[PDB]
Amino acid sequence: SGHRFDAQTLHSFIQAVFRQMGSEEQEAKLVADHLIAANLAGHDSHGIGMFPSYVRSWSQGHLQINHHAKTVKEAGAAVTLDGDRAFGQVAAHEAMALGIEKAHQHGIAAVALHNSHHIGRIGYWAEQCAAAGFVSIHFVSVVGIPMVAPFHGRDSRFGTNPFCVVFPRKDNFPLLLDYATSAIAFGKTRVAWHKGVPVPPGCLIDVNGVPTTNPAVMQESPLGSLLTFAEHKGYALAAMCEILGGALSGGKTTHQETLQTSPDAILNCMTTIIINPELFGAPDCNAQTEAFAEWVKASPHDDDKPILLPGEWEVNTRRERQKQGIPLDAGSWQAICDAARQIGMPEETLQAFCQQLAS
Amino acid sequence: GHRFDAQTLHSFIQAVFRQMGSEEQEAKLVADHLIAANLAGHDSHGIGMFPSYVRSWSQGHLQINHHAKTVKEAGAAVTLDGDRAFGQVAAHEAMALGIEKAHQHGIAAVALHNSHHIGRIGYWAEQCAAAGFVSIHFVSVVGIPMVAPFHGRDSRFGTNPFCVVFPRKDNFPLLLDYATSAIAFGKTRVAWHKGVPVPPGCLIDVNGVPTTNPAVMQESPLGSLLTFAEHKGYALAAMCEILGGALSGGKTTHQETLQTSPDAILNCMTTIIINPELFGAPDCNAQTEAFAEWVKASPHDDDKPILLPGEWEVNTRRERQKQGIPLDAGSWQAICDAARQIGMPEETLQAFCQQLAS
Ligand SMILES: NC(=O)c1ccc[n+]([C@@H]2O[C@H](COP(=O)([O-])OP(=O)(O)OC[C@H]3O[C@@H](n4cnc5c(N)ncnc54)[C@H](O)[C@@H]3O)[C@@H](O)[C@H]2O)c1
Numbered sequence: 001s002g003h004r005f006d007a008q009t010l011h012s013f014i015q016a017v018f019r020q021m022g023s024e025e026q027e028a029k030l031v032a033d034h035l036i037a038a039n040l041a042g043h044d045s046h047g048i049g050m051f052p053s054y055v056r057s058w059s060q061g062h063l064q065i066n067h068h069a070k071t072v073k074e075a076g077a078a079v080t081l082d083g084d085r086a087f088g089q090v091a092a093h094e095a096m097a098l099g100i101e102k103a104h105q106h107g108i109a110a111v112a113l114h115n116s117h118h119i120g121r122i123g124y125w126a127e128q129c130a131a132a133g134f135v136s137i138h139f140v141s142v143v144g145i146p147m148v149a150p151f152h153g154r155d156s157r158f159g160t161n162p163f164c165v166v167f168p169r170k171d172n173f174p175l176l177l178d179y180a181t182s183a184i185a186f187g188k189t190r191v192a193w194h195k196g197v198p199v200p201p202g203c204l205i206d207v208n209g210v211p212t213t214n215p216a217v218m219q220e221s222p223l224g225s226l227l228t229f230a231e232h233k234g235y236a237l238a239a240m241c242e243i244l245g246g247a248l249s250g251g252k253t254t255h256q257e258t259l260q261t262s263p264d265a266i267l268n269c270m271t272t273i274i275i276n277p278e279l280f281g282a283p284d285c286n287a288q289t290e291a292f293a294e295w296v297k298a299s300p301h302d303d304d305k306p307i308l309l310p311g312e313w314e315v316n317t318r319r320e321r322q323k324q325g326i327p328l329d330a331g332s333w334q335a336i337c338d339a340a341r342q343i344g345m346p347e348e349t350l351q352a353f354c355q356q357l358a359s
Numbered sequence: 360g361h362r363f364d365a366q367t368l369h370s371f372i373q374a375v376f377r378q379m380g381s382e383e384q385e386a387k388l389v390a391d392h393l394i395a396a397n398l399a400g401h402d403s404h405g406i407g408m409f410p411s412y413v414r415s416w417s418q419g420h421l422q423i424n425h426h427a428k429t430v431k432e433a434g435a436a437v438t439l440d441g442d443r444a445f446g447q448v449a450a451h452e453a454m455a456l457g458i459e460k461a462h463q464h465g466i467a468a469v470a471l472h473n474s475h476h477i478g479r480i481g482y483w484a485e486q487c488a489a490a491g492f493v494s495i496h497f498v499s500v501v502g503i504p505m506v507a508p509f510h511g512r513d514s515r516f517g518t519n520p521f522c523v524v525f526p527r528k529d530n531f532p533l534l535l536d537y538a539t540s541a542i543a544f545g546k547t548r549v550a551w552h553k554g555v556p557v558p559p560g561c562l563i564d565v566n567g568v569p570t571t572n573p574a575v576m577q578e579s580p581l582g583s584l585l586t587f588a589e590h591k592g593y594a595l596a597a598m599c600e601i602l603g604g605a606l607s608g609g610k611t612t613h614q615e616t617l618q619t620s621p622d623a624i625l626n627c628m629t630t631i632i633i634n635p636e637l638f639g640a641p642d643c644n645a646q647t648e649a650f651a652e653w654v655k656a657s658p659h660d661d662d663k664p665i666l667l668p669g670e671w672e673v674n675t676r677r678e679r680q681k682q683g684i685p686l687d688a689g690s691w692q693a694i695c696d697a698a699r700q701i702g703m704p705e706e707t708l709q710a711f712c713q714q715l716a717s
């Protein structure tokens with residue numbers, strides 16, 4: 001028995017909860033901006049539901065509040081940053097701003113960010129680049145929490161290592177590819193497990209390497225493992241993200257020495273290439289893009305399942321959720337409220353927010 | 360079938376292109392790329408392309424003795440028109456210009472539109488990696504719809520490959536190179552000739568119904584390839600269409616741009632080339648090697664060990680350099696027929712066959 005929450009009011013609440021944690025004003029805003037945007041886009045695993053986990057990471061000495069990305073190298077068209085375990089919502093925002101400026105100066109630039117706390121929905125960083133008028137390409141690794149098996153392997157070796165590319169369009173939503181290199185997102189298994197239903201086949205193996213559709217293998221001991229998408233194809237991409245993101249950013253790849261001591265210590269590396277599309281000799285680019293968009297959607301389909309462009313799913317969800325509210329399941333909401341209580345938000349403050357959110 | 364010595368097969372291929380009309384350097388460039396594809400184990404893009412190239416040329420698509428022309432040069436980006444040259448020529452010229460530009464700028468891009476078939480994409484990435492660079496390639500196939508969008512029931516775009524490479528000092532490069540379709544078009548051609556099913560989740564028929572019958576890609580009524588991993592391969596195919604086809608200054612697939620022949624294989628490719636040394640990553644080598652060993656330690660069958668991206672092609676090349684390139688009899692017959700079609704004298708062709716047989 002879930003709820004629908006007004007996005008503006010819920011943002012106010014999320015921001016208040018990070019102030020209570022100790023975040024200063026700008027930090028709390030940056031965190032709330034990213035989390036609410038993930039909820040609006042339909043990517044709820046990276047939304048307000050991350051809050052209890054973030055408190056745990058911080059309490060355990062991993063996530064550091066009120067930190068900033070530090071420049072460790074700047075050379076030609078590339079800047080390299082140490083996220084210093086800051087909120088990824090802070091460090092990646094700082095990284096994009098520096099990278100976008102570098103692309104203004106050089107036409108094509110790169111920003112590498114290692115050792116940032118969880119950077120959330122990667123499409124959000126791409127949207128910043130696209131709003132400034134650039135193409136961007138992002139290789140992301142998750143440092144030292146193995147949860148995905150290599151093709152041919154029977155246990156976890158690397159993170160869900162997302163890949164993201166964006167193409168900006170004048171007066172339209174950007175074409176946005178953004179996804180994990182695993183066969184299914186980790187959060188999907190968490191949802192399926194709570195609901196008592198299986199996941200699709202070809203996504204999971206159990207502790208012994210045997211294919212399974214039971215999501216309990218990702219949520220209870222003995223832990224199994226996620227598979228990569230499309231066998232060797234998702235695996236090749238996950239490995240390229242590990243190396244271009246993890247190693248090439250100046251960060252850590254996953255191996256014995258680098259494993260996290262907690263499942264809440266979620267650290268990302270990201271290498272981003274930012275490209276001014278106007279440098280190319282493509283006078284007909286807009287018309288060719290639009291002609292293809294129209295042609296691809298004319299493919300025969302069920303009425304309830306029209307063809308989408310990359311990034312259109314998020315745009316449509318956002319529109320629905322601005323109008324109807326953000327849905328939160330009752331268990332996640334309880335966990336959120338309980339976590340807010342435990343960091344010292346007074347009961348009366350939480351009551352007043354709940355009354356505002358009931359409207 | 361047969362097993363052919365790579366070096367002899369190279370001489371043959373080169374001579375066949377001279378006979379077609381290619382000048383020496385073009386014939387060499389075409390032979391280099393085709394034999395490398397066979398050595399790497401990607402036979403669809405190897406010597407077996409020759410009959411299709413002859414058909415394409417005869418129909419006025421592929422042009423012999425053409426070159427990529429620089430149509431724009433702005434900052435770190437160069438844009439080329441391939442002029443329907445052999446892709447083995449146009450893309451070679453594109454990589455050379457792009458690598459030069461990346462020497463100059465640290466990070467550069469080269470866009471190539473309107474090139475004839477550029478073959479195995481990893482080959483261009485290997486040139487970038489050999490010069491010390493990371494490269495990323497978005498490729499579209501112009502106006503040959505073969506693959507359905509996720510939720511669609513017919514073909515709307517090409518097999519649109521994606522490629523990324525990371526160079527390693529004194530080692531093979533980490534090389535991702537694949538089509539965005541669920542299965543290679545070539546594999547369906549093979550499974551048809553051999554009369555076997557393809558795996559499930561790869562094909563739909565003319566009415567959009569799932570099938571394992573490769574007949575649907577080979578006879579009428581034509582069905583369609585699916586993308587890999589549903590929306591995932593579909594989103595990547597669409598980004599390749601746009602970043603490759605549209606942004607390179609080329610054409611995307613839609614009604615007005617459909618080819619009139621299945622052999623009119625024209626590629627657009629947008630390549631970003633990145634000097635990895637610009638990043639502040641003093642432990643990059645060690646972190647890369649540590650990951651490589653760690654990922655291989657995952658429990659596995661002895662006969663199916665874990666590979667790095669690119670390792671498969673490296674191993675195949677070693678095996679085929681030693682054992683020879685295998686060619687199926689039907690393909691070899693098509694190659695010999697195409698050689699006669701472009702006027703190679705019977706005695707020249709026979710001389711080559713005898714040298715290849717021994
Ligand atoms: N920060 C991290 O370490 C981390 C790790 C893994 C995943 N993530 C994030 O989790 C989120 C979800 O990941 P996922 O792998 O579950 O993604 P997903 O399976 O939901 O894929 C979403 C992508 O596919 C597109 N898409 C959806 N439906 C489509 C359709 N019918 N046609 C064409 N395209 C369609 C979307 O527009 C988007 O590009 C992403 O935002 C990702 O960045 C973050």
Ligand SMILES: NC(=O)c1ccc[n+]([C@@H]2O[C@H](COP(=O)([O-])OP(=O)(O)OC[C@H]3O[C@@H](n4cnc5c(N)ncnc54)[C@H](O)[C@@H]3O)[C@@H](O)[C@H]2O)c1
Nearest residue numbers: 232478479480518520534535536537538543666668669671
């Ligand atoms: N228009 C075009 O020019 C065009 C179109 C489509 C495909 N192609 C080419 O066709 C070729 C084949 O495409 P495909 O989709 O069938 O490729 P594929 O399925 O053979 O995948 C090849 C990729 O996966 C990697 N790989 C293979 N086994 C692996 C393993 N066990 N672990 C990790 N990685 C592994 C390879 O090293 C390579 O990067 C490619 O070279 C592609 O460039 C060209």
